[PDB]
Design a protein around this nucleic acid. Structure first.
Ligand SMILES: C[S@@+](CC[C@H](N)C(=O)[O-])C[C@H]1O[C@@H](n2cnc3c(N)ncnc32)[C@H](O)[C@@H]1O
Ligand SMILES: C[S@@+](CC[C@H](N)C(=O)[O-])C[C@H]1O[C@@H](n2cnc3c(N)ncnc32)[C@H](O)[C@@H]1O
Ligand SMILES: [Zn+2]
Ligand SMILES: [Zn+2]
Ligand SMILES: [Zn+2]
Ligand SMILES: [Zn+2]
Ligand SMILES: [Zn+2]
Ligand SMILES: [Zn+2]
Lengths: 222, 97, 86, 110, 100, 103, 82, 222, 109, 95
DNA sequence: CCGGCACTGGAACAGGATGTATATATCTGACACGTGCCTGGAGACTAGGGAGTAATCCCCTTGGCGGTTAAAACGCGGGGGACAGCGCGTACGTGCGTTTAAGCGGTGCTAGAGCTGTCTACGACCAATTGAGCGGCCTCGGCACCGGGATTCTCCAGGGGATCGGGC
DNA sequence: GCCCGATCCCCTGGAGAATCCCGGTGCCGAGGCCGCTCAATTGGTCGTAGACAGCTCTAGCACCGCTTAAACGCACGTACGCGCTGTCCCCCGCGTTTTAACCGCCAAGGGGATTACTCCCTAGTCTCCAGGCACGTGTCAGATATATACATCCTGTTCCAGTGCCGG
C-alpha cells in the first residue's frame, strides 16, 4: 500500500505468445551509411549520419567504423539512472540522479506480442470483472505490446500534458521496436514523464490531474 | 597562265529553277554557295539511309523502292507527302516513252 | 472477327506509378498537376518510335513487329540501347 | 550511235541531271548494283525541295523593295516555316543574323 | 490502447528515395503498358502482331527517358529556391534541351 | 557670367532597349579581326609548331564562335526570368550548360 | 616570338554587343570573366581536329575544308564556305 | 516698359550658322513599329507604341497604320493656346488659358545652330559689353541652340524649383530636337514653368526666389 | 598446301580473329581495296578496349561478395570512370539502374 | 535448319580468364558485351572510309586506321591504344 | 531454565518448458564440359594498275611603313533593383479500411515465318560517235552622285491709305 | 466753327529657297558569247540476283479459375508557398583623353599543284584441312525446410536446517 509494488516478472527481450515471430534478416538487406573513420564521434549523436537521421540502427558488420560507432544502443542496454521510486500524486513514478542533455534515450518498452483478437478478449474479460487493464501499445496492424504481467522499469510510467519524453519507433535488424527518449534538457531528481494520445473505443475515464498552464485537458481530448 | 582544271556544281540548274517561280529576280554570288551546300547535304542523307535499308534485308541493289522509304524516314509530315507524288509521277512518265 | 478495339488506356499509368518514377530520380515533394502532364509527355515520345518501327516493318513485307525494328528505330534518333540483340 | 541522241532529263521532264546523279551513285560506295529508276526518282525530289525554298526567299525579298536575293533572305525564309526549320535545325548560315524577338516582361511599362 | 508518435513529413519519402535508387526492376504494370502500345499502333496499320520481346524493349526506353527528365526538372526548382516541382519546370527543361 | 541649359537625361533602360533593336537587325561581325586572329595562332601552337593559315580558314572560325555565344546568351535569359529577375548572373550560364549537356 | 595574354583582346564592349544581339537588358559584373573561359574551351576542340586532318595529308597549311570537316564532326554544320 | 516684350523675329524652324547642317535621312534607316490598322487610336497615347516609348517619331511612308497615326507632332505644329502675358516677378514669362492633360506637350524650342567657339566669343562679348546672355541650350557636342535673334513664345520663359514642364529630347527623321512636355495636370489659367540646371564656368548670380516648399534652392547646386 | 597451317592471330599474338575481321571489312562496302595490316591493327584495339571494361566490373563485383557478373556491375563500372562515361555517353544498358545520389538541400537540418 | 549465328562469346570468355582467373559471367551480360564490340567496330571503320574518300584514295590502310582512332577515343585511351596497335603490326611482319 | 516440539525458509531436485544444432525430403536450374562435322580460312602462284619519287612553275602567305579617325579606357553621380525578414492560409503527406484487377498456372488452335528448287528478265561491260557544260574576254545599262535652272511659296522691303492735336 | 501735316494697319518689287523635278557621269557586279574537250547516249552480249510456288512447324492469341498485393477514398494537422515592406549598394548614362585597328603600298620567297616513269602490293583461282557450333552428359549453388535430444536459464516442490514457543 506504501512500498514496492507486488512482484512483476522481469524480462529483458521481447517474447512471443501468439503466431507472428521476429524477422531475422541476413546481412544483405540492412542499410549502410557513408561515414568515415574519424574523431571521437563517428556515427555519433552530433554527426551527419544518414542511418541515424532516418531512425535506423547500424550493424557492427556493415558500418565502416567497425566497433567505434555509437549507433548501437538497442542491443547493448546501457540504460541511464532513475530506477523505481514512489510517487504521492500517482502510483510510483521515477526520479533521476544525473542531468541528461537532449538527445539520449531511456529504457526500451518490452512486453509480450499479443494480437488484436487477444487484446479484445483480455480487455473484455478485465471489463466484465472490473480489472481495467491499461498496459497496451499498438506498434503495427495485428501486433500489440503488452506490459501487464511482465515488463521493466518503463511500464511504471505516467501521462503528462507538459511532458519531457517521446515514444518514437525505430527499425533494428529488419524489425520494428519502440523506445523512450528525452525531449529537451532537464535537471536531475525530478519525475520524467511522457504524453500519449489515447484512442478509446468506449468512454473516457478521467481528467489529467497534472498542474501547469494547460494540463487541465482530459484523457483523450486530442 | 595555265587554264586550271574544271570544277562542277549545280549553279546552272538552280538558275533554271529560279526563272520559273520568279521571272524577274536575281541572285548573289554568295547566296549561290549556300544552295550548293544545301543540295550536296540533302543528297547524302538520303543515299546513306537507303544504303542501310538495303543491307538490313540482305539485298545488294538500290531500286526506286528504297528511295521512297528513305524519303519517308527523313522528311517531316507534310513535306514527305508531296515529294512522293513528284517522284512517282516522274518515274511513270519516264518508263512510258 | 477478333477485332477488340481499345480506348482510354492512358489512365492505366496510375498516380503511384508516377510517384515511384519520380522517387528514383531524387524528388522529395510533388505538386498535384504533374500527373496530367507526364502522360502527355509520354504519349508524344511513344508515337515517334512506333511510327518508325511500323515503317521498317512494312518494307520487309511482313505482319509481325520484331525486336530489331525497335532497336533500329531507336538508334535512328540517337538513343542506342544495349542488350536486346544487334 | 545511229539515231538522234536525247538526254534522260527530257524523257522524264526535269531540269536536274539524271546522268550525273547516276554516276555519283555508282562511284560512291553505296551498294554493288544500282537500278534504273533510282536516279529518276532522286532528281525529282532534289528539284522540288529547291523550288520550295526559292519561292519563299523571293517573297521575303519582295517585301523590302529589292530585286535580288542575299543571304539574309534565305535565313528569314527558313526560320519562319515550321517544317523547313525542323529539317534544318542544326545548321548555321553565314551572314544570316537572327529573328527580332523581345520578351514581354522586359518592355518598359507605366 | 495508446499509440506512438507518427513520423514527420519528409522521412518516409527520404527513406524510399534511398531504396528505389538501389534496385533495378521495372516500375510499371505490364498489362496496362501493353494495352496502350497496341492502341497507339492502330493509327498506322490494322491487324498487327507483336513479338513477345518487342514490348519488353519499349518499356525500358520509356522508363529511362522519364527517370532522366525528372533529374533535370529537379534542378530548376532548386534554382528558383523551392523544393516542390511544378508543371512549369518540365517546360523549361524541355525547351532548353531543344524539344519543345 | 552666363549659364548654359541642359535637357533631361534618359531613363535607365532606354539606351539599352534601342541597342537591342539596332543589333537584332544587322548582320555584321561584332569582334575585332586582328585581336581575334592573334588568339587562334596562340592556341594552335601547343599542337604543332610553325604552321600557316589561310585567310579564309581564319574567317570560318569567327563565324562559328559568334553563332555559339549568341545562342548561349538566349538560354541564360530564360533562366534569369525563371528565377524572377532581370539581371543575368554567373550561375545561370552553369545551369544552362549543365541542362544542355556540356559541363 | 611566343604569344601570350591574347585572351584580353576580347574586350568588355565586344561582349556587351553579343549580349544585346542575344537579347538581354541588364548585365552583372562577373560575366566578363565567365565568358572568356567558355570561349577558350570551344576553340581547342575544333583546332585539335583541324590539325589532325592537316597532318594526315602531309601539308603545312590549315585550309578552309579542314575546319568545315572538324565542325561537321560535332554536329555544327556550316553552309557557305565551300 | 509697359507693353509686349522688345521686338523679336518670329520663325518656325532652325537654320545653320556654322559648318554642319541637318543629316538628311533616307527612307531606309527610319525605325518601325508593330501597330495594326485598328480602333480610333493607332500609335496613340494610351497604347503601347514601340516607337513612342523609346522617344522616336513615325514617318507616314513606313508606318503600317498610314496617316491615321497620331505620332506626328514635331512636324505638324499644332501648338496650343496661351499667348504672351507680362509677369510681375520677372520680366515677361507666359500664362495659359485652358487645361492640359498630363502627357501632352507645348511649343517646340527653336533657334539657331550656334557652335562652341562662337558661343565662347558671344559670352565674352556679352561680358565686355554688358549683355549677360541667357539663351543657350546644349543638344549635342558642338551642336547648340540659341534663341536670341530667332524664337517664339518659348524663349519668354523662366525658372522654378517645383515646375510643371519638362524638357526631353526626341529623334525625328534622324535629327535630334527638343520639345517641352507638361509634368503634371494643370488647371486652366496659371503660369506654367520648366526647370533647367545651369552649367557655367563663371560665378553664381542669384537664387530661385519663388514661393514653395523646395522653391529656395539656388542656381547651380540642385 | 605443303607446310603446316598456322593462324594469323598467333603470329601477332592476339586472341581475336584476324581472318574474320578481314572478311567483315571486305564485304561491308567501306572501300574498294583493303591492305594487309589493317585487320592486324584493328583487332588489337578491339581487344584492348574490351580487356579493361571487365577489369573494373570484376572489381565492382568483388565489393559485393559475389562470384558472377550481372548487368548492374557493368553500369557501376561505366558510370564511375571519366573516359568511358564520355565514350558511352548516349547509351542505355538494360537492367542497369542508376547511381546513388541525393542532393544537399533536401536533407534535414 | 538453324544454320548458325556468329558472336564473340568464346573470345570474351578467353580474355576474362587472364584478368580474373576465378569469375564467371551470365547470358544477359554476354549479350551486352557482344553489342559493345559490334558498336565500336562500325564507328571505327565508317570514318577511315570517309578519310580515304576526302583524300582521293582507294585503299584502307593501317595509317587510316591509326588516324581514325585519335579522333574517336578521348584522352589517355587513345594514347594507350595507339601504342598497343603498333606492337602487333611490328611483330606480325617480322615473321 | 533446559529440552521437547511444532513452525518456518534460501536453495537446490525432478520433471518439464523451451532454444540451437543436427540427420533427412527431395527438388532444380543454370554456368561450365565432350564430341562429330561441315564449312570457311590458309598456302602457292600469276597479272595488271595504284601509289611513290623527282623535277618545275607560279601563287599567295608573311613582313614592314605611314597617316587618320573611330573605338576603348577612366572617373562621376544617382536612382532602381536584389535581398532579407514577417505573416497568413491553402494544399500536400501520413495512416486506416474496403474494393478491384494483375499475376500464375494450364488447354486448344491456327496464322504466318523460314527454308528449298526453277527459271526468266535485268544490270555490268565494251566499242564508237557527238554535243552539253566550263573558262576567258566583252559589252550594255540601269544605279548613286552633281548640276541646275526656277518653281509654288513665302519674305524683307519699305510703300500707300483711314486717322488725329491742335492748326486755321 | 472746317482742316494741316504727320501718323500707324493694309500691301507687293524683287528675292531666296530648297528642291518638285529634269538631265549628265562614273560605277563595279551580274549577264552574254565563241571555242573545245571529255563525259553521256546508242547498240549488243552474258550470266547471276531475285521472283514465285510449296511445305513444315514454332509461337502468338484466346479462354478459365484462384489467391493476394496493390490501388482507392477519406480524415486531419502542419510545413511550405506567396505577398508585402524597408535598406543600401552596384550598375547605367555622360564627358575627356589616349591608343591601336584600318587602309593603302611594296617586296621576297616557301610550298601547293601538275606531269612523267617505274615497281611492288593486292585481287583472283584452285587445293586442302582443322576450328567453331549445335546437341548431349555431369556436378554442384550448397539454398531452403523439417524433425530432434537436451544447452544453459527460469521455477513447483520435499525433506532439511534454523527458530521460537509450550511445557516439565
Ligand atoms: C500506467 S499506470 C502507471 C503506474 C501503475 N498504475 C502503478 O500503480 O504501478 C497509471 C494509471 O493511472 C492513470 N494516470 C496516470 N497518470 C495520470 C494523470 N497524470 N492524469 C490522469 N490519470 C493518470 C492512467 O489512466 C493509468 O491507468
Ligand atoms: C530665360 S530669360 C527669358 C525672360 C526674359 N528674358 C526676362 O527675364 O525678362 C529669363 C531671365 O531672367 C532670369 N529669371 C527668370 N526667372 C527667374 C527666377 N524665378 N529666379 C531667378 N532668375 C530668374 C533668368 O536668369 C534669365 O536670365
Ligand atoms: Zn555507425
Ligand atoms: Zn553513419
Ligand atoms: Zn493534465
Ligand atoms: Zn507604332
Ligand atoms: Zn505610327
Ligand atoms: Zn522657386
Amino acid at each position: 500500500n506504501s512500498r514496492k509494488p507486488p512482484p512483476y516478472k522481469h524480462i529483458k527481450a521481447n517474447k512471443v505468445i501468439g503466431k507472428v515471430q521476429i524477422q531475422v534478416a541476413d546481412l544483405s538487406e540492412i542499410p549502410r551509411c557513408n561515414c568515415k573513420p574519424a574523431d571521437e564521434n563517428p556515427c555519433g549523436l552530433e554527426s551527419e549520419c544518414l542511418n541515424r537521421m532516418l531512425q535506423y540502427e547500424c550493424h557492427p558488420q556493415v558500418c565502416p567504423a567497425g566497433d567505434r560507432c555509437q549507433n548501437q544502443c538497442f542491443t547493448k542496454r546501457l540504460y541511464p539512472d532513475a530506477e523505481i521510486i514512489k510517487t504521492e500524486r500517482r502510483g510510483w513514478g521515477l526520479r533521476t540522479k544525473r542531468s541528461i542533455k537532449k538527445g539520449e534515450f531511456v529504457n526500451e518498452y518490452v512486453g509480450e506480442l499479443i494480437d488484436k483478437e487477444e487484446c479484445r478478449l483480455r480487455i473484455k474479460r478485465a471489463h466484465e470483472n472490473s480489472v481495467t487493464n491499461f498496459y497496451m501499445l499498438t506498434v503495427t496492424k495485428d501486433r500489440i505490446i503488452d506490459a501487464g504481467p511482465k515488463g521493466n522499469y518503463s511500464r511504471f510510467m505516467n501521462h503528462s500534458c507538459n511532458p519531457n519524453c517521446e515514444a518514437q519507433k525505430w527499425t533494428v535488424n529488419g524489425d520494428v521496436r519502440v523506445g523512450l527518449f528525452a525531449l529537451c534538457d532537464i535537471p536531475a531528481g525530478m519525475e520524467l514523464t511522457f504524453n500519449y494520445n489515447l484512442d478509446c473505443l468506449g468512454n473516457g475515464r478521467t481528467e489529467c490531474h497534472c498542474g501547469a498552464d494547460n494540463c487541465s485537458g482530459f484523457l483523450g481530448v486530442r | 597562265k595555265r587554264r586550271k582544271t574544271r570544277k562542277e556544281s549545280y549553279a546552272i540548274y538552280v538558275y533554271k529553277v529560279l526563272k520559273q517561280v520568279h521571272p524577274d529576280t536575281g541572285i548573289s554570288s554568295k547566296a549561290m554557295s549556300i544552295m550548293n551546300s544545301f543540295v550536296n547535304d540533302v543528297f547524302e542523307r538520303i543515299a546513306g539511309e537507303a544504303s542501310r535499308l538495303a543491307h538490313y534485308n540482305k539485298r545488294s541493289t538500290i531500286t526506286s523502292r528504297e528511295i521512297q522509304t528513305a524519303v519517308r524516314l527523313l522528311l517531316p509530315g507534310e513535306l514527305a507527302k508531296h515529294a512522293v507524288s513528284e517522284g512517282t509521277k516522274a518515274v511513270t512518265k519516264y518508263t512510258s516513252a | 472477327r477478333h477485332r477488340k478495339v481499345l480506348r482510354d488506356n492512358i489512365q492505366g499509368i496510375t498516380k503511384p506509378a508516377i510517384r515511384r518514377l519520380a522517387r528514383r530520380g531524387g524528388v522529395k515533394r510533388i505538386s498535384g498537376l504533374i500527373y496530367e502532364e507526364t502522360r502527355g509527355v509520354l504519349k508524344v515520345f511513344l508515337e515517334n518510335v512506333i511510327r518508325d518501327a511500323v515503317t521498317y516493318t512494312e518494307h520487309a513485307k511482313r505482319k509481325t513487329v520484331t525486336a530489331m525494328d525497335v532497336v533500329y528505330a531507336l538508334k535512328r534518333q540517337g538513343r542506342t540501347l544495349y542488350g536486346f540483340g544487334g | 550511235t545511229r539515231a538522234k541522241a536525247k538526254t534522260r532529263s527530257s524523257r522524264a521532264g526535269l531540269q536536274f541531271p539524271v546522268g550525273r546523279v547516276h554516276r555519283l551513285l555508282r562511284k560512291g560506295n553505296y551498294a554493288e548494283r544500282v537500278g534504273a529508276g533510282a536516279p529518276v526518282y532522286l532528281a525529282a525530289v532534289l528539284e522540288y525541295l529547291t523550288a520550295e525554298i526559292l519561292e519563299l526567299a523571293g517573297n521575303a525579298a519582295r517585301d523590302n523593295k529589292k530585286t535580288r536575293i542575299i543571304p539574309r533572305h534565305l535565313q528569314l525564309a527558313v526560320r519562319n516555316d515550321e517544317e523547313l526549320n525542323k529539317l534544318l535545325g542544326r545548321v548555321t548560315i553565314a551572314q544570316g543574323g537572327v529573328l527580332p524577338n523581345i520578351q514581354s516582361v522586359l518592355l518598359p511599362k507605366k | 490502447v495508446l499509440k506512438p508518435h507518427r513520423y514527420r513529413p519528409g522521412t518516409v519519402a527520404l527513406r524510399e528515395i534511398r531504396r528505389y535508387q538501389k534496385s533495378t526492376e521495372l516500375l510499371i504494370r505490364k498489362l496496362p503498358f501493353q494495352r496502350l502500345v497496341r492502341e497507339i499502333a492502330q493509327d498506322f496499320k490494322t491487324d498487327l502482331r507483336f513479338q513477345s520481346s518487342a514490348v519488353l524493349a519499349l518499356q525500358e526506353a520509356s522508363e529511362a527517358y522519364l527517370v532522366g527528365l525528372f533529374e533535370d526538372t529537379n534542378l530548376c526548382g532548386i534554382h528558383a529556391k523551392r523544393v516542390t516541382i511544378l508543371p512549369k519546370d518540365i517546360q523549361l527543361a524541355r525547351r532548353i534541351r531543344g524539344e519543345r
